[PDB]
Ligand binder design. Structure first.
Ligand code: HEM
Ligand code: HEM
Ligand SMILES: CCOc1ccc(-c2ccc3c(C)cc(N)nc3c2)cc1CN
Ligand SMILES: CCOc1ccc(-c2ccc3c(C)cc(N)nc3c2)cc1CN
Ligand SMILES: C[C@H](O)[C@H](O)[C@H]1CNc2nc(N)[nH]c(=O)c2N1
Ligand SMILES: C[C@H](O)[C@H](O)[C@H]1CNc2nc(N)[nH]c(=O)c2N1
Ligand SMILES: [Cl-]
Ligand SMILES: [Cl-]
Ligand SMILES: [Gd]
Ligand SMILES: [Gd]
Ligand SMILES: [Zn+2]
Lengths: 400, 402
């Protein structure tokens, strides 16, 4: 039972939940790979275990309906080679996958999640409407609400529902006559696919990509997103009057549409989930990463900072002001956003809850500590244990 | 079958083949990663020794030579006759540099080959130990033009106690527990402070009182020694534009000289081998001054800056922290004392990673310690995946001798 210490306070806890981890991770006694981004009778064992989890959490292990539900999945798989989840089970599984996501700093919210059941989806035009209901509900005029839409589970003999976009909202990335990119470089690949499938490319740095939706076996089909459905925030700074003229914007809804939701041995390769942004994701990663919009030097010239020496901390200064502009603009636009100090304090509170509730919490330090001001937040001084519990969200290869 | 390592800023891929030779084992398993934890027989002495001798004779391009097989036989003979063996001077110099090179949490390792090794293995008492230390401080400080150095005292051996430096660093500020339960000075040094008082030291009552040395000769109690004031170069902190900042009375010392770690070379253990380099500005600015459990100045600075400290979304902590780091950099430069900022240091560590990939096929690096504690993703090391593992020769943590 691993001993974990908090260095800010001195306290000690023990992670007894780690003793039950499953689909093993990347590390071995000889070497640690914690920093790397990307590291059939067996269906019945994953299904038994999940069902035991479910009746655990509703104060009802070892009695009528628990016994009975074990039998039906037995008979279902025995007759069909797969099984269907009761609707409450799907809800409970979706929330547990969020609760188990080790890289997620927003899990204090894990019990408030809206699950739209789309398991009876049947076409690409159907998805688009399921997606569009989600986007509408999650956005909610800027009062964001966490939501996931679960499309049909995978099964052999036939294909897969899949969203070729990494997120429901992404900005175009356009190559050049010199390699360089106008727009978002993280999305150059999926932009070529959209053009390659009919889309009429735009001219700008913030052109919202269309959606490439894939119904089983059939080739993808483009979908234009309704402009009023995609809520966006123009970026301005509370006191630097020229910042608005940089023409920067970001969207309101972080909606992740390429991950595979795995519940009880069932695999849903299309289960887009959405929450709300932590400010540093927008300000520091999307706008300042050298391989994203890379605006840091442009903001610093405008602030008349000494870009000639690194010891002036011109990067640090411009980065804070960008983050200020993000928090300021989203607030002025009445769009739910949370700062990395508030976020990390809530996560600390989540760890204390998870300690008493399950004897621990799987956390990936490198992704929990924010990308600016790390040691100024309390999670920096908190030792953490990382491991894989089920149900979970997993990464999957691109559909091509 | 070797780990693939990507740099996300550039798209580069490399494989770390050196990890396969990881000579000891760490805290992680396929069940659970513990990478974020701060603190994770003649035949075996023979095998560690054999491996080190092989390393040494490789570095001088004499692997499998006459002299290489002679040294293997000499060591086996000495371990048989005495249970231990003695390093040649050149082996000690190589092993000390290798230990620095292998330190996974050190971002300064581009410098690993420019290391001044002082051999104090002939040391006989705590009083001689003090003289060696004073000379190390003098050579390394060099009037502010800092130089990396290590002094290595006699090895652990059967029949004798260890030489030990009780202080975690050669230069530290006292931490006085008081009541109301609070600490005046550096809270990290409360324990060693209480030990010094208990061993004869007359404490002060300042926030920046330099601690005496507690030095332990074999089979002896520890002895107190006052550092001569003129040997401890300090930097009063001021800010280039915020002029009230000098009225805080803040200071830091020039020389980071870690003194409580064990150096291991070829199976042999040096429980006393203090080493020193120069500071990266975030150690002083962010960690030593702003940690809530250290000097904890962030709120006071922010109130002074007239930042709105009633809400976190003003980012007052980030703004005050940036100005504290600017003040440290400016102050050390004004004082003509070597200091590197976290951007220059991480950029040179990337060059180190590239040198090391061409030379040994990899580099042990602990991402959570290599990424600076502010502005992480603004430095290039953030976007570099890394493989952590333990090579020998090595610096190791050891229990406090009390
Ligand atoms: C409600 C506010 C939320 C916030 C502030 C938030 C924040 C974050 C952040 C900062 C990351 C780091 C990813 C990175 O930077 O690489 C992350 C990852 C992640 N989030 Fe959350 N998120 C929220 C809601 C949700 C919801 C509703 C779900 C799904 C039900 C979710 C599932 C995940 C998963 C699966 C990951 C990746 C985990 C891993 O790969 O181990 N999050 N989130
Ligand atoms: C020349 C400038 C140097 C710089 C800028 C530097 C920087 C650093 C930093 C920032 C850390 C992490 C400290 C923290 O906890 O925040 C570290 C750790 C460390 N450094 Fe360096 N250092 C330098 C020289 C040296 C030298 C000369 C040695 C030994 C010969 C050394 C050996 C170590 C070791 C052993 C650790 C702990 C690593 C571990 O436990 O794995 N460093 N260094
Ligand atoms: C490791 C591959 O990259 C990612 C993986 C997951 C996410 C992620 C996934 C879901 C999120 C949600 C739901 C909200 C939010 N504010 N941030 C989120 C961030 C971001 C990234 C962007 N680095
Ligand atoms: C787990 C114990 O923590 C440490 C471990 C090593 C060091 C360390 C050790 C040697 C250093 C040297 C030689 C220079 C420098 N700038 N920083 C150094 C930092 C600091 C610390 C302070 N957290
Ligand atoms: C708990 C956590 O791992 C611990 O605070 C580590 C994180 N990274 C660090 N990084 C550096 N450079 N120095 C440190 O002391 C630490 N502390
Ligand atoms: C190379 C490194 O592992 C990689 O950049 C990781 C580290 N930490 C991160 N932290 C956040 N918040 N987001 C990320 O994408 C990453 N990526
Ligand atoms: Cl994003
Ligand atoms: Cl220090
Ligand atoms: Gd101007
Ligand atoms: Gd001023
Ligand atoms: Zn690990």
């Amino acid at each position: 039972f691993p001993r974990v210490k908090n260095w800010e306070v001195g306290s000690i806890t023990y992670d007894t939940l780690s003793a039950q981890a499953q689909q093993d991770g990347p590390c071995t006694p000889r070497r640690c790979l914690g920093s790397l981004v990307f590291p059939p009778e067996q269906l019945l064992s994953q299904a038994r275990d999940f069902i035991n989890q479910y009746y655990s959490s509703i104060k009802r292990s070892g009695s009528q309906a628990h016994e009975q539900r074990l039998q039906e999945v037995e008979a279902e798989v025995a007759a069909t080679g797969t099984y269907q989840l009761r609707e409450s089970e799907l809800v409970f599984g979706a929330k547990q996958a969020w609760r188990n996501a080790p890289r997620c700093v927003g899990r204090i919210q894990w019990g408030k999640l809206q699950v739209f059941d789309a398991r009876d989806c049947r076409s690409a035009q159907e998805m688009f409407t399921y997606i569009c209901n989600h986007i509408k509900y999650a956005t909610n005029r800027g009062n964001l609400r966490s939501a996931i839409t679960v499309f049909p589970q995978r099964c052999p003999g036939r294909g897969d529902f899949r969203i070729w976009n990494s997120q429901l909202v992404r900005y175009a990335g356009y190559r050049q006559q010199d390699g360089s990119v106008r727009g978002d470089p993280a999305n150059v690949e999926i932009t070529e696919l959209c053009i390659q499938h009919g889309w009429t490319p735009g001219n700008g740095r913030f052109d919202v990509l269309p959606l490439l939706l894939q119904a089983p076996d059939e080739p993808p089909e483009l979908f234009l997103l309704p402009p009023e459905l995609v809520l966006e925030v123009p970026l301005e700074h509370p006191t630097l009057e020229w910042f608005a003229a940089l023409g920067l914007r970001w969207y309101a809804l972080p909606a992740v549409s390429n991950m595979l939701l795995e519940i009880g041995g069932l695999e849903f390769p299309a289960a887009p989930f959405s929450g709300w942004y932590m400010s540093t994701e927008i300000g520091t990663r999307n706008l300042c990463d050298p391989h994203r919009y890379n605006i840091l030097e442009d903001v610093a010239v405008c602030m008349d900072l000494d870009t000639r020496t690194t010891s002036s901390l011109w990067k640090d200064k411009a980065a804070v002001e960008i983050n200020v502009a993000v928090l300021h603009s989203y607030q002025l636009a009445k769009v739910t956003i949370v700062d990395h100090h508030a976020a990390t304090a809530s996560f600390m509170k989540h760890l204390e809850n998870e300690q008493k509730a399950r004897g621990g919490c799987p956390a990936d330090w490198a992704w929990i500590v924010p990308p600016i001001s790390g040691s100024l937040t309390p999670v920096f001084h908190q030792e953490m244990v990382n491991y894989f519990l089920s149900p979970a969200f997993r990464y999957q290869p691109d559909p091509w």
